[PDB]
A = this chain, B = another copy of it.
Amino acid sequence: ASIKKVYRGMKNGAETINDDLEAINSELTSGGNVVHKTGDETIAGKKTFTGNVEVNGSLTLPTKSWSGELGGGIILSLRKKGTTVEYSIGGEISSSILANSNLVNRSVPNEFCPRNRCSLVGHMVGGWNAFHIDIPSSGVCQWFGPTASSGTPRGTGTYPIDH
């Protein structure tokens, strides 16, 4: 709080002592540079919690969405939440996608890209067939099913990101 000096022989001493006590007391309830048990507040700095942090409301992390046709009709939808990317595979295969081939319509943007190669396991509607798509750190996704020219690929999960 903004306070005024108190000193011997001071002019208007009781008033200044009171003004100071009030200015300081004000910041114990709201405002100033102190974090309080009520109120909407923005907190800067590295805050390290050594105990148990319990969130009863919501924990909101940085979020961003993206969707694109990776290639061959396969559509990847992403939502970044903190250091995790939630993915969903969709669309329908529209042309021959060769075994172990790069999907070269659209790459995953760098902000959604993992540190390491992530293998996203999926299933084709209608039978027992599984595939995976790798997202490397470059974002050029790669199809690791066999050669396929049709069908409906699906799979929801997550992969990690960092910063």
Contact = CB atoms under 8 A, between A and B. Distances in A.
A52 B46 CA distance: 5
B35 A46 contact: no
Interface stretch (A68-76, A81-89, A101-109): A81-89
B46 A50 contact: no
A54 B45 contact: no
A47 B46 contact: no
Contact of A50 (B20, B32, B44, B124): B44
B17 A17 contact: yes
Nearest to A122: B121
Query: Top 7 closest A-B pairs, CB basis?
Result: A130-B130, A128-B129, A119-B154, A6-B18, A123-B132, A40-B46, A35-B35
